[PDB]
Design an enzyme around this catalytic site. Structure first.
Site, mmCIF file in Angstrom:
data_model
loop_
_atom_site.group_PDB
_atom_site.id
_atom_site.type_symbol
_atom_site.label_atom_id
_atom_site.label_comp_id
_atom_site.label_asym_id
_atom_site.label_seq_id
_atom_site.Cartn_x
_atom_site.Cartn_y
_atom_site.Cartn_z
ATOM 1 N N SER A 68 38.586 77.199 77.222
ATOM 2 C CA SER A 68 38.300 77.800 75.696
ATOM 3 C C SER A 68 39.542 76.977 74.560
ATOM 4 O O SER A 68 39.683 75.978 74.970
ATOM 5 C CB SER A 68 38.834 78.566 76.637
ATOM 6 N N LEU A 82 42.076 83.931 77.010
ATOM 7 C CA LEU A 82 41.777 84.208 75.777
ATOM 8 C C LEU A 82 40.967 83.446 75.282
ATOM 9 O O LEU A 82 41.421 82.016 75.596
ATOM 10 C CB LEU A 82 42.598 84.515 74.692
ATOM 11 N N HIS A 93 40.450 75.718 81.552
ATOM 12 C CA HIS A 93 41.365 76.135 82.506
ATOM 13 C C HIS A 93 41.035 75.715 84.104
ATOM 14 O O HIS A 93 41.943 76.408 84.996
ATOM 15 C CB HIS A 93 40.113 78.102 81.761
ATOM 16 N N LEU A 95 39.295 73.206 86.586
ATOM 17 C CA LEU A 95 38.613 71.584 86.859
ATOM 18 C C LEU A 95 38.708 71.973 88.916
ATOM 19 O O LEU A 95 39.855 71.823 88.855
ATOM 20 C CB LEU A 95 39.285 70.927 86.082
ATOM 21 N N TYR A 139 46.301 63.257 85.931
ATOM 22 C CA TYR A 139 46.149 63.562 84.521
ATOM 23 C C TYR A 139 47.009 62.662 83.068
ATOM 24 O O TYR A 139 45.740 62.407 82.418
ATOM 25 C CB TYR A 139 46.237 64.852 84.428
HETATM 26 C C1 LIG Z 1 41.090 67.258 91.164
HETATM 27 C C2 LIG Z 1 40.007 66.900 91.320
HETATM 28 C C3 LIG Z 1 39.210 67.547 90.469
HETATM 29 C C4 LIG Z 1 40.054 64.800 90.872
HETATM 30 O O1 LIG Z 1 38.197 65.018 91.853
HETATM 31 P P1 LIG Z 1 37.476 63.645 92.943
HETATM 32 O O2 LIG Z 1 38.148 64.521 94.370
HETATM 33 O O3 LIG Z 1 36.412 63.257 92.760
HETATM 34 O O4 LIG Z 1 38.944 62.616 92.989
HETATM 35 P P2 LIG Z 1 38.739 60.670 92.411
HETATM 36 O O5 LIG Z 1 37.587 61.050 93.064
HETATM 37 O O6 LIG Z 1 37.603 60.777 90.681
HETATM 38 O O7 LIG Z 1 39.951 60.401 92.220
HETATM 39 C C5 LIG Z 1 40.653 60.902 92.792
HETATM 40 C C6 LIG Z 1 42.165 60.762 91.813
HETATM 41 O O8 LIG Z 1 42.465 62.759 92.233
HETATM 42 C C7 LIG Z 1 43.758 62.985 92.500
HETATM 43 N N1 LIG Z 1 43.946 63.859 93.711
HETATM 44 C C8 LIG Z 1 42.373 64.606 94.655
HETATM 45 N N2 LIG Z 1 43.412 65.188 95.536
HETATM 46 C C9 LIG Z 1 44.847 65.713 95.479
HETATM 47 C C10 LIG Z 1 45.874 66.143 95.829
HETATM 48 N N3 LIG Z 1 45.656 66.781 96.992
HETATM 49 N N4 LIG Z 1 46.762 66.063 95.661
HETATM 50 C C11 LIG Z 1 47.546 64.651 93.807
HETATM 51 N N5 LIG Z 1 46.568 63.612 93.633
HETATM 52 C C12 LIG Z 1 45.359 64.705 94.329
HETATM 53 C C13 LIG Z 1 44.560 61.496 92.576
HETATM 54 O O9 LIG Z 1 45.465 60.726 92.038
HETATM 55 C C14 LIG Z 1 42.891 60.874 92.899
HETATM 56 O O10 LIG Z 1 43.315 59.582 92.660
HETATM 57 P P3 LIG Z 1 43.105 58.139 94.693
HETATM 58 O O11 LIG Z 1 42.026 57.485 93.992
HETATM 59 O O12 LIG Z 1 44.129 56.998 94.069
HETATM 60 O O13 LIG Z 1 43.242 59.174 95.986
HETATM 61 C C15 LIG Z 1 39.425 67.383 92.747
HETATM 62 O O14 LIG Z 1 40.041 66.723 93.562
HETATM 63 C C16 LIG Z 1 39.043 68.637 93.286
HETATM 64 O O15 LIG Z 1 38.515 69.912 93.051
HETATM 65 N N6 LIG Z 1 40.418 69.561 94.269
HETATM 66 C C17 LIG Z 1 40.975 70.444 94.641
HETATM 67 C C18 LIG Z 1 40.853 71.923 92.802
HETATM 68 C C19 LIG Z 1 42.438 71.425 92.508
HETATM 69 O O16 LIG Z 1 43.482 71.093 92.837
HETATM 70 N N7 LIG Z 1 42.029 70.735 90.962
HETATM 71 C C20 LIG Z 1 42.662 70.972 89.618
HETATM 72 C C21 LIG Z 1 43.546 71.556 89.851
HETATM 73 S S1 LIG Z 1 44.107 71.028 87.845
HETATM 74 C C22 LIG Z 1 43.192 71.773 86.703
HETATM 75 C C23 LIG Z 1 42.745 73.278 86.920
HETATM 76 O O17 LIG Z 1 41.925 73.305 87.534
HETATM 77 N N8 LIG Z 1 44.700 74.039 87.088
HETATM 78 C C24 LIG Z 1 43.851 75.699 86.712
HETATM 79 C C25 LIG Z 1 45.404 75.491 87.138
HETATM 80 C C26 LIG Z 1 45.702 76.942 88.401
HETATM 81 C C27 LIG Z 1 45.539 78.256 88.063
HETATM 82 N N9 LIG Z 1 45.596 79.228 89.272
HETATM 83 C C28 LIG Z 1 45.489 78.282 90.250
HETATM 84 C C29 LIG Z 1 45.385 78.297 91.730
HETATM 85 C C30 LIG Z 1 45.803 77.231 92.263
HETATM 86 C C31 LIG Z 1 46.296 76.193 92.133
HETATM 87 C C32 LIG Z 1 45.729 75.842 90.679
HETATM 88 C C33 LIG Z 1 46.193 76.492 90.065
#
Ligand SMILES: CC(C)(COP(=O)(O)OP(=O)(O)OC[C@H]1O[C@@H](n2cnc3c(N)ncnc32)[C@H](O)[C@@H]1OP(=O)(O)O)[C@@H](O)C(=O)NCCC(=O)NCCSCC(=O)NCCc1c[nH]c2ccccc12
Length: 166
Positions: A68, A82, A93, A95, A139
């Site tokens: 958005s 918004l 918002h 991911l 990020y």
């Molecule tokens: C992060 C994502 C999209 C990456 O996908 P993937 O798993 O396929 O990852 P990749 O395979 O592409 O690569 C992995 C990398 O992802 C990072 N990573 C993954 N899990 C991690 C963890 N637990 N701690 C630290 N780094 C981590 C690492 O750095 C890792 O590096 P490494 O290869 O060296 O291991 C995927 O893991 C996912 O959907 N997770 C669940 C939801 C989420 O948190 N969305 C993001 C919140 S940030 C954006 C957002 O939506 N904000 C709203 C804010 C919000 C509002 N209300 C909430 C309530 C609760 C929480 C948050 C909010």
């Protein structure tokens, strides 16, 4: 005649259902809240679908970004629900990647196509989102720079705001 093995496309309010489902596991099962509820999901998918992006594997959403437009330097509580048409910022918002499809470069892949997708729009000049400190280094691999404490409050959770010049 079949279900594409892989498909990247913008979402429509028809996908709201699927988005929430992954949100339930991705966020609610964790912190007890989620970035967008069904009405909020359908809200941005109705007003600005071109700001969304999904990965469909065999006819099933496995990844998504819901955007958005924002028109201020920093994110606020109001910007949460918004869409500033006149804005120049892509406000991510939410991911998430499905619980079964994580750690396979999908999030990274979707994120890059997204940045390239919205940066292609005439308005969008910058991208912005908030995240828990744990994801800041993640990020940063995409060009996002930590912009200090995010003002938006969500339950007991705090987030670091991040901006990416587009
Ligand atoms: C992060 C994502 C999209 C990456 O996908 P993937 O798993 O396929 O990852 P990749 O395979 O592409 O690569 C992995 C990398 O992802 C990072 N990573 C993954 N899990 C991690 C963890 N637990 N701690 C630290 N780094 C981590 C690492 O750095 C890792 O590096 P490494 O290869 O060296 O291991 C995927 O893991 C996912 O959907 N997770 C669940 C939801 C989420 O948190 N969305 C993001 C919140 S940030 C954006 C957002 O939506 N904000 C709203 C804010 C919000 C509002 N209300 C909430 C309530 C609760 C929480 C948050 C909010």
């Amino acid at each position: 005649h079949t279900l594409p093995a892989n498909e990247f496309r913008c979402l429509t309010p028809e996908d709201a259902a699927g988005v929430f489902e992954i949100e339930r596991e991705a966020f609610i099962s964790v912190s007890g809240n989620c970035p967008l509820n069904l009405d909020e999901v359908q809200h941005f998918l109705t007003l600005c679908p071109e700001l969304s992006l999904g990965w469909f594997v065999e006819g099933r959403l496995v990844a998504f970004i819901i955007g958005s437009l924002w028109d201020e330097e920093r994110l606020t509580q109001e910007s949460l629900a918004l869409h500033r048409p006149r804005g120049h910022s892509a406000h991510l918002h939410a991911l998430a990647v499905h619980r079964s499809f994580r750690q396979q470069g999908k999030g990274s892949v979707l994120l890059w196509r997204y940045l390239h997708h919205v940066g292609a729009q005439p308005a969008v000049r910058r991208a912005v989102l908030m995240c828990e400190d744990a994801l800041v280094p993640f990020y940063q691999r995409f060009g996002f720079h930590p912009a200090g404490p995010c003002a938006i409050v969500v339950g007991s959770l705090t987030f670091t705001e991040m901006h990416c010049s587009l």
